Design a protein around this ligand. Structure first.
Ligand SMILES: [Mg+2]
Ligand SMILES: [Mg+2]
Ligand SMILES: [Mg+2]
Ligand SMILES: [Mg+2]
Lengths: 242, 240, 235, 238, 233, 230, 246, 230, 102
């Protein structure tokens, strides 16, 4: 019975409802992030359920303020919620401190909010995991947040179904390029890793989506990868995919 | 009777008990000791996945200029306690005109936990907090609190799965020395002692990226960096 | 605060049960005074009975009540009682009529019965009081919030027993000195312990001495109980 | 928390169970004559050594021309009464005319109804017989209200334990062509009915008569006894 | 219910056949003391709008903050943030007008006078005013404070009616605005010599000139003036 | 009380509807000469004064409604319905539209910020200039439908079926009166007399009129005769 | 959770209260002995490891300069109760009459707190029982015991927790109404020794008394109406000095 | 066990209540939506409970440039459309800006979500097809009570929707190009709604059509005016 | 002190003919002795064959007009596109104005 109400600790000290939330997460699309040399890239798998979908429209990545990028996997709506609050939490920081919210700061804000939903049985934890980050006064930052409200900083991160395939690919990158990775490179790379990771869901045609926040490529602001730059990576992935 | 913090027929609070187990979920061990004029807390640092940014993994926190706190328990619950410990410490200063003392801060935190213990809607937090500092009145200090709302001060202490072994080791030292503190003038050595006696009890050698040290002296608390630790680790590889 | 398929209030019914396990209190309404007596629950050689007050409480200079149930639940109800008393006095400058105070206290209890979700109060009261409209009165209120007035009554442990003993010896023209005796007798025969001793009793009266005009409430002191005991012959 | 809720069969258990408490309560009855209404009730006998002088009587004045009696949890009634009394004055104060029995009833009814669809409150364990006369009118009024909140008028009606039995007595002993055209006979009839359940008892029955223009009076233990006797006679004479 | 402290004077502006020009000095006065000299009072919002504000500065600085957030918040979940669904001058105005009218209706006004000058996506020039009372109006030229008394008369000489707008070149308009700014330096005690001008043209987009100075001033004649009546020397 | 079933229905709402099936039959029929509303009284004894049973109420001069189910629940609903027509007359100096009125009532229904749904349904019949004579049925779900004729309550199953047969886009007020009477008779356990059934109608010219027992009896009789034909 | 967690069971018991009473029963023993010119309350400093520091755990607390409290049950529940007790001492009293409340009154207030826990929605009773000792100009010396039910009653001497019965028994034989403070201390010590498992000395025991006024503990000389607090906690040294006289 | 509220994830990470809510949709009549690059149509097959009632209105106008078709629990649709009307209104009044369809979508999602994360609440049980013309062309959005919103060239929802969904899934290349001519787009819209029929053919009371586009404000064509589309 | 009110002059005139009505207004908008605009309409079409002008303090005139136009919008909503008759419109405005009686 220890898994019917949220705030309940089981005899082994686990909060089951949280872990179940995690399952909702696993059952979703894959997404990743690659902290690069002076920025971060985000990418996610948009599953095309039907020809009836208007192409490149149901955007899933989201921006917070102007320098933070957010992407998450799971119950989509739960993600949006997490982002709206992010936005309110970021505005509030700016209004009072003038400088846009530092990533470490922002993450913790999102952290504390989610953790709060594992404190009362009147609430269900969040059915999503979020990868987000950006550039600030001192470096790029990439974080991932799980339904327990647990979060940490990453070199690369991914989540959703293609999670393991993706992590594998990321692990390669870290060992092969400890120096860093140009934003351009990381872009294509993410495109790839998503393509690869797509195999754990190898049954439906997909639409890639990438975004980046780079100190030399986008001035520290979060922009979406579109046009020439997007196609380049789509092909770079279609290449090394065989 | 086993879902909310009410009493069980034997007069027990199960949810409180299970929260004590979650404190071990992380599998980290830590210890704190007091020097002549400082305080050290070592905690193992364990970074599994290679994709993690090692620098962001810590269970040791800077609560205020003078108070450092180490947590044994899951991170969410841990950070929750931190923020509050931080907030409270500040408020205390604004309203009373001097920095919140570590013990007072521990007591305050303990009282807050007790409430989760007594009200059904609040789940306890699965974490244990050791607050260390060199109090302007009391001197080097270590105060630890738990999910039951219990809090108390220690000559030295340890927390983690291998708590019992560490404690005995320390218990022995102080029983041999007769004093309630490491008799060393510089924190460096105390840190050394601390790590030495940690290795001595866990039966494991440590590298620089496997520890986490926090030191507190008169007017400041700081966490050493890998390099700093290394200078320690090196120096110990001479006595042993 | 819910109904049983039979049409009863669980928590209320159960409350009354808790009460039946409480010491016995008796209130006997004489023609020139009222007596209240109560047998104390759980004692010892070490309990200080001298400076004690656990079953007999003064509400107003003209109304006293005897308690059967949770001492703590009682005190809450009492304090508010004492307050309604004073409010009425301020508003009208006349002491509050017993029934008014009693009915008010009842209404609170009933509240716990009908809404909120809070456990009722584990208490029953015997009110001994005087007023210029009906003279001496004896009242009783229980957890359902119901109240009624008596010539003699008891609450707590062994009601049927005592109630039956009172119904037997009581007579319309009684006198305090006699009611005191009766009270003692009844308690004496309905105790659950060896023998009635001063240290286990709480006794009090509300008489209107002929050599004056205002009613005098006398809460008996330990020695006096020991004395009133010898006389009645419980020895 | 929603206590009074629907069940798979379309019932609000708490309300339904509320009625049970009504049945457990003593009996109360009222029949209306040609220029009067009477209400009789049987007295509770769980324990006896009562001080009749003070004990909260069963029939209460809502206003100088309207009374109410009930059957159910004695406590729950008091509230209904207060709310009714207070509303009686308020109507006077703002409409410059005392309540009509109907209005008062509809007021009391709505109060109960409300408790059946409000969270954290259990329905009232009570049914009331409200009677009296409209201001500057002579046509007698008798109304009935139940925990559901439903209400209506009755030439005669009863509630409380064994109400079914006495209801029957009335169903045939009261004809809507010659309503008890005298205080005396209306009383008789009520007593007669009451006897069928009360079980030969003087202090067991209390009878209250209500006449036009604030003329209300409760009969003393003995005035009733006289009726009892004359009734046992019109029984023994056969 | 307040009283302005540090303040900024007139903001002049007018519309020409292909866009709008607006200008305002760079002074923040503390009563009669010309305290702050580096105060920009034209706030460009995007690539098609400039908001000129006079009145209390602290309140202007707030309106600034508010405008930035408007931009930021418009980007949110808006893939067309820099195209079809970007902020139009008209949207910005309405927001502002509304705020002003609410603050006054709550008796805690934004002690200001603002002119929103810009060009709409379809080409239409946009020029509209709103003040601490929520009063709003539009016209070929607009000016607040002294500019209203002095600048409008001059500017209206170029554009008296709507039909005159399509007959006016940027050269002309810009010249006018600059002259007006010069007049105000002469006649307005709270003016400052250095100003800022911005043109929003339906082709060149937004041009924002900073650090301009009033030049070509006639003062030589002040030598032939002595006394205030009968003094000969 | 806000829990969905595996079938996708709200429990308390479904149950609420069952309680309604236990109530007196209410029938309304909508013509081009008016709308008739008739109900079955159903006295729990013959001591009860049949006239103190209110199941057809006037909401406003051009709107009346019949009820069925736990009738006490309907008090607040009528109150609100009245207040709303009135308020609408106050703010707009005109008659509220039957639909609007109804919608206003339903708007109240789903407010599950009252422990349970209403255990009662209504037949709101009325007339307004733009949509003529209209009949509406309002359910505790919060949903409402317009019908040409409709029956609710215990005997609604058979009644609805019979309505389906008797209704055509061209009856006269009298006709419908009879049918309601008829169908009332067909589903009433007791025999239809003027002390246990109630008819009412609403017309452009005279508005909402509840028929006086006497007029009803004349129709009941007029019915017995027309029925005992073949 | 706005409903009472402590409800009435069919036998007529308040589940949670009895359970809380059980928790109390398992706590370390504490005693109070009321003499003629004083009262003593003591307990044992159950060190849960020799690494912890004994002093940093006041099991015995000053509520007002003339009233102390000791407990048995869950320490945390006690700690917060002492806070609230000291508080109400001021709010409901020192801020209205300029003097601290009398023992029975404070006791009464504390009780009120615990009762609320017994009936307010969403909480559990306090798992503690306190022995509160004090003195006041009009009622003299008194000792009270307060339970999770809220019930309180005075004693000449008593003990609670673990060895309550044995202890009460020993107290019952040694107590008489002519006891001078030192003696009750003696008895407190003696009674304590039998329930104490290991080392019995000034660092494992905690005695506090309520007696004559201590001017030396006031902090200032000048105003002569208040001669000092009556509550004084015993020092390790003072305790041992007495132990040595076993 | 795990389907008591929405605050409970099952062991496989599902929210049954939400899911059950989604099932409420399937028991509603089919409603189709389809757009070209200049228009958006909403063809909604209305439903009847008996042969004497109204075919429940499935189309609601939310602003002169936007509207939606509902399938499921009407009440909820009212609540949701109304919220949509307000937000459209707020954009007009405060920014003199027409609310972007995508933006409206973001709003409904956010609204639905709150009802799928808190104790005591209940997910909304109704689906909606929102069409609207704006600064970026014609739009069609499908809204599901789970909180998910998707932009589509066409679709349909409700009982047997899957029929029309394939028709459109193939007819895309054909309708995405019906620019400058609304009649055709509607025809297609009807042709689509018919591949999810079974009961009978779409009638003059069955049909409900809504169109909006370049030089055409959201208009509701009910009954008579749809005659030429069967 | 802050004065929440102002005057923008202007003059309007409504005349009702046997089967038509006119609402005329000058176009000038002023403040004190300055002309704020030579062209700022003040008589508007509120839809439903209703013209209205709120002349006096322009801000209030503006707000009122907006609230009314909007009131027309909602009326159509809550009452199946029913045309708002002039008299109904009138009673409505009474309420709008009176809502701000203080
Ligand atoms: Mg993992
Ligand atoms: Mg809790
Ligand atoms: Mg809880
Ligand atoms: Mg009209």
């Amino acid at each position: 019975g220890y898994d019917l109400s949220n705030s309940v600790f089981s005899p082994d000290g686990r909060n089951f409802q949280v872990e179940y939330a995690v399952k909702a997460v696993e059952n979703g699309t894959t997404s990743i992030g690659i902290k690069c040399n002076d920025g971060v890239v985000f990418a996610v798998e948009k599953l095309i359920t039907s020809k009836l979908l208007v192409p490149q429209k149901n955007v899933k990545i989201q921006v917070v303020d102007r320098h933070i990028g957010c992407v998450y996997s799971g119950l989509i709506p739960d993600g949006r919620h997490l982002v709206n609050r992010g936005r309110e939490e970021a505005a509030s920081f700016k209004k009072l401190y003038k400088t846009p919210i530092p990533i470490p700061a922002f993450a913790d804000r999102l952290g504390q909010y989610v953790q709060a939903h594992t404190l009362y049985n009147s609430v269900r934890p969040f059915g999503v995991s979020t990868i987000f980050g950006g550039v600030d006064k001192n470096g790029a930052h990439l974080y991932m947040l799980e339904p327990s409200g647990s979060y940490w900083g990453y070199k690369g991160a991914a989540t959703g179904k293609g999670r393991q395939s993706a992590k594998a690919e990321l692990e390669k990158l870290v060992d092969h390029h400890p120096e860093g990775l140009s934003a351009r490179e990381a872009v294509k790379q993410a495109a790839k890793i998503i393509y690869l990771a797509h195999e754990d869901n190898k049954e439906k045609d997909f639409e890639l989506e990438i975004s980046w926040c780079s100190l030399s490529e986008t001035n520290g602001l979060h922009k979406f990868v579109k046009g020439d730059l997007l196609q380049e990576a789509i092909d770079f992935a279609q290449k090394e995919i065989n | 009777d086993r879902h909310i913090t009410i009493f069980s027929p034997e007069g027990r609070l199960y949810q409180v008990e299970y929260a004590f187990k979650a404190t071990n979920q992380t599998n980290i061990n830590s210890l704190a000791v007091r020097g002549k004029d400082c305080t050290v807390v070592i905690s193992q640092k364990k970074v599994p996945d290679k994709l993690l940014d090692p620098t962001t993994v810590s269970y040791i926190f800077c609560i205020s200029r003078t108070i450092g706190m180490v947590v044994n328990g899951p991170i969410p619950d841990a950070r929750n306690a931190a923020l509050r410990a931080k907030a409270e410490a500040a408020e205390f200063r604004y309203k009373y005109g001097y920095d919140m003392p570590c013990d007072v801060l521990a007591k305050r935190m303990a009282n807050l936990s007790q409430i989760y213990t007594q009200r059904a809607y609040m789940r306890p937090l699965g974490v244990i907090l050791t607050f260390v500092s060199v109090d302007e009145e009391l001197g080097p200090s270590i105060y630890k609190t738990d999910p039951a709302g219990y809090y108390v001060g220690y000559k030295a202490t340890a927390t983690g799965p291998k708590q019992q072994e560490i404690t005995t080791n320390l218990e022995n030292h102080f029983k041999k020395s007769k004093i309630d503190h490491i008799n060393e003038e510089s924190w460096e050595k105390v840190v050394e002692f601390a790590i030495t006696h940690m290795i001595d009890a866990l039966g494991t050698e440590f590298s620089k990226n496997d520890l986490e040290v926090g030191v507190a002296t008169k007017d400041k608390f700081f966490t050493l960096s890998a390099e700093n630790i290394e200078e320690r680790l090196v120096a110990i590889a001479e006595q042993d | 605060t819910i109904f049983s398929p039979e049409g009863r209030l669980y928590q209320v019914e159960y409350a009354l049960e808790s009460i039946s396990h409480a010491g016995t209190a008796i209130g006997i309404m004489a023609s020139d005074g009222i007596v209240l007596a109560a047998e104390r629950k759980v004692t010892s050689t070490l309990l200080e009975q001298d400076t004690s007050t656990e079953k007999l409480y003064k509400l107003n200079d003209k109304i006293a009540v005897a308690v059967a149930g949770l001492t703590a639940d009682a005190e809450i109800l009492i304090n508010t009682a004492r307050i309604h008393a004073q409010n009425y006095l301020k508003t009208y400058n006349e002491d509050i009529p017993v029934e008014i105070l009693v009915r008010r206290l009842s209404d609170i209890k009933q509240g716990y019965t009908q809404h909120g979700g809070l456990r009722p109060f584990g208490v029953s009261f015997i009110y001994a009081g005087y007023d210029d409209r009906y003279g001496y009165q004896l009242y009783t209120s229980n957890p359902s919030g119901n109240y009624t007035g008596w010539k003699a009554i008891s609450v707590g442990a062994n009601t049927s027993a005592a109630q039956t003993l009172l119904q037997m010896d009581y007579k319309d023209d009684m006198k305090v000195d006699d009611a005191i005796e009766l009270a003692l007798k009844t308690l004496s025969k309905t105790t659950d312990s060896s023998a009635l001793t001063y240290d286990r009793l709480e006794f009090a009266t509300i008489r209107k001495g002929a050599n004056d005009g205002e009613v005098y409430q006398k809460i008996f002191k330990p020695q006096e109980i020991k004395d009133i005991l010898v006389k009645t012959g419980i020895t | 928390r929603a206590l009074s809720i629907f069940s798979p069969d379309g019932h609000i258990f708490q309300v339904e169970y509320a009625l049970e408490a009504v049945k457990r309560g003593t009996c109360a009855v009222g029949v209306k004559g040609k220029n009067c209404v009477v209400l009789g009730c049987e007295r509770r006998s769980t324990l006896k050594l009562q001080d009749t002088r003070i004990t909260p009587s069963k029939v209460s004045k809502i206003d100088s021309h309207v009374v109410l009696s009930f059957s159910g949890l004695n406590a729950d009634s008091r509230i209904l009464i207060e709310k009714a009394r207070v509303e009686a004055q308020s109507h006077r104060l703002t409409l410059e005319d005392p309540v009509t029995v109907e209005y008062l009833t509809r007021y009391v009814a709505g109060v109960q109804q409300r408790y059946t669809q409000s969270g954290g409150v259990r329905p009232f364990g009570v049914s009331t017989l409200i009677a009296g006369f409209d201001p500057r009118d002579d046509e007698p009024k008798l109304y009935q209200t139940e925990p559901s909140g439903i209400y209506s008028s009755w030439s005669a009606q009863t509630i409380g334990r064994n109400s079914k039995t006495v209801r029957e007595f009335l169903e045939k002993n009261y004809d809507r062509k010659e309503p008890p055209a005298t205080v005396e006979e209306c009383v008789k009839l009520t007593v007669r009915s009451l006897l069928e359940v009360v079980q030969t008892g003087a202090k067991n029955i209390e009878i209250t008569v209500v006449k036009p223009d604030s003329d209300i009076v409760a009969l003393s233990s003995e005035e009733i006894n006289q009726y009892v006797t004359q009734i046992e006679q019109e029984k023994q004479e056969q | 219910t307040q009283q302005p402290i540090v303040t900024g004077t007139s903001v002049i502006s007018m519309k020409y056949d292909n866009g709008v020009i607006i200008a305002a000095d760079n002074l923040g006065s503390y009563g009669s003391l010309l305290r702050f000299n580096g105060v920009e009072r034209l706030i460009p919002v995007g690539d098609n709008t400039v908001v000129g504000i006079s009145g209390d500065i602290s309140d202007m600085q707030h309106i600034e903050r508010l405008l930035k957030d408007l931009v930021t918040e418009n980007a949110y979940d808006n893939p067309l943030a820099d195209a079809e669904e970007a902020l139009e001058p008209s949207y910005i105005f309405e927001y502002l007008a509304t705020v002003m009218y609410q603050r006054r209706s709550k008796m805690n006004p934004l002690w200001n006078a603002i002119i929103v000058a810009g060009v709409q996506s379809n080409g239409d020039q946009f020029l509209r005013y709103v003040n601490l009372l929520g009063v709003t109006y539009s016209s070929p030229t607009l000016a607040t404070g002294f500019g209203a008394h002095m600048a409008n008369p001059l500017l209206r000489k170029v554009v008296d009616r709507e039909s005159d707008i399509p007959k006016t070149t940027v050269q002309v308009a810009e010249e006018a605005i600059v002259n007006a700014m010069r007049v105000l330096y002469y006649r307005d005690a709270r003016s400052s010599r250095n100003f800022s001008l911005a043109i929003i043209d339906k082709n060149t987009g937004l041009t924002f000139k900073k650090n301009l100075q009033v030049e070509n001033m006639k003062w030589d004649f002040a030598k032939d003036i002595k006394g205030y009546g009968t003094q000969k020397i | 009380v806000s829990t969905f079933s595996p079938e996708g229905r709200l429990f308390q709402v479904e149950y609420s509807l069952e309680a309604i099936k236990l109530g007196s039959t209410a029938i309304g029929i909508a013509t081009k000469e008016g709308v008739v509303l008739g109900v079955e009284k159903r006295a729990t004894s013959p001591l009860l004064e049949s006239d103190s049973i209110e199941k057809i109420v006037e909401i406003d001069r051009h709107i009346g409604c019949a009820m069925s189910g736990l009738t006490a629940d309907a008090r607040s609903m009528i109150e609100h319905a009245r207040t709303a027509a009135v308020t609408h007359n106050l703010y707009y100096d005109e008659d509220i539209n039957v639909e609007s009125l109804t919608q206003s009532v339903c708007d109240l229904a789903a407010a599950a910020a009252m422990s349970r749904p209403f255990g009662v349904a209504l037949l709101i019949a009325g007339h307004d200039a733009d949509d003529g004579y209209q009949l509406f049925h309002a359910e505790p779900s919060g949903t409402f439908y317009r019908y040409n004729a409709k029956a609710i309550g215990s005997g609604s199953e058979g009644a609805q079926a019979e309505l389906l047969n008797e209704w055509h886009s061209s009856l006269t007020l009298k006709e419908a009166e009879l049918l309601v009477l008829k169908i009332l008779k067909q589903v009433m356990e007791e025999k239809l007399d003027e002390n246990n059934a109630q008819l009412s109608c609403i017309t452009k010219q005279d508005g909402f009129k509840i028929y006086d027992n006497e007029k009803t009896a004349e129709l009941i009789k007029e019915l017995k005769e027309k029925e005992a034909a073949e | 959770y706005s409903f009472s967690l402590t409800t009435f069971s069919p036998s007529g018991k308040l589940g949670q209260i009895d359970y809380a009473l059980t928790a109390v029963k398992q706590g370390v023993t504490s005693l109070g002995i009321k003499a003629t010119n004083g009262v003593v309350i003591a307990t044992e400093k159950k060190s849960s490891s020799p690494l912890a520091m004994s002093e940093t755990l006041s099991k015995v607390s000053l509520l007002t300069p003339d009233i102390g409290a000791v407990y048995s049950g869950m320490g945390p529940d006690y700690r917060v109760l002492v806070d609230k007790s000291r508080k109400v001492a001021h709010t409901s009293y020192k801020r209205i009459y300029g003097e601290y409340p009398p023992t029975k009154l404070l006791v009464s207030e504390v009780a009120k707190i615990m009762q609320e826990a017994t009936q307010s929605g969403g909480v559990r009773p306090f798992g503690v029982s306190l022995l509160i000792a004090g003195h006041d100009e009009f009622n003299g010396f008194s000792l009270y015991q307060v339970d999770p039910s809220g019930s309180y009653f005075p004693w000449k001497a008593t003990a609670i927790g673990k060895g309550s019965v044995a202890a009460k028994t020993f107290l019952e034989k040694r107590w008489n109404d002519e006891l001078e403070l030192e003696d009750a201390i003696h008895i407190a010590l003696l009674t304590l020794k039998e329930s104490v498992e290991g080392e019995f000395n000034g660092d494992t025991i905690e005695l506090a008394i309520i007696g004559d006024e201590n001017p030396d503990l006031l902090g200032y000389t000048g105003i002569p109406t208040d001669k000092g607090p009556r509550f004084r906690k015993l020092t390790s040294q003072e305790i041992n000095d007495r132990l040595e006289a076993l | 066990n795990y389907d008591g509220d929405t605050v409970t994830f099952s062991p496989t990470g599902r929210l049954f209540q939400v899911e059950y809510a989604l099932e409420a949709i399937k028991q509603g009549s089919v409603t189709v939506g389809l757009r070209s690059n200049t228009h958006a149509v909403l063809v909604a097959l209305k439903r009847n409970a008996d042969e004497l009632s109204s075919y429940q209105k499935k189309i609601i106008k939310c602003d002169e440039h936007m509207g939606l078709s509902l399938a499921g629990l009407a009440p909820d649709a009212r609540v949701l459309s109304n919220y949509l009307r307000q937000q459209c209104n707020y954009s007009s009044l405060v920014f003199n800006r027409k609310l972007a369809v995508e933006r409206a979508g973001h709003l409904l999602c956010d609204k639905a979500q709150k009802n799928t994360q808190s104790a005591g609440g209940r997910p909304y049980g109704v689906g909606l097809l929102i069409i609207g013309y704006d600064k970026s062309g014609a739009h069609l959005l499908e809204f599901q009570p789970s909180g998910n919103v998707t932009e589509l060239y066409g679709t349909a929802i409700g009982a047997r929707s899957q029929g029309a969904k394939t028709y459109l899934e193939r007819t895309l290349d054909t309708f995405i190009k019906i620019d400058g001519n609304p009649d055709e787009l509607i025809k297609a819209g009807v042709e689509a709604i018919s591949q999810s029929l079974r009961d009978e053919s779409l009638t003059v009371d069955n049909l409900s059509i809504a169109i909006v586009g370049k030089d055409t404000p959201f208009t509701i064509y009910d009954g008579e005016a749809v005659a030429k589309y069967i | 002190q802050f004065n929440p009110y102002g005057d923008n002059g202007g003059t309007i005139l409504g005349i009702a003919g046997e089967d038509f009505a006119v609402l005329a207004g000058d176009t000038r908008n002023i403040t004190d002795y300055s002309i704020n605009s030579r062209y700022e309409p003040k008589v508007f079409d509120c839809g439903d064959n209703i013209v209205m002008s709120a002349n006096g303090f322009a801000a209030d005139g503006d707000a009122l007009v907006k609230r009314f136009k909007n009131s027309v919008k909602w009326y159509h909503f809550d009452h199946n596109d029913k045309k708002l008759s002039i008299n109904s419109a009138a009673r409505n405005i009474q309420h709008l104005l009176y809502g701000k009686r203080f």
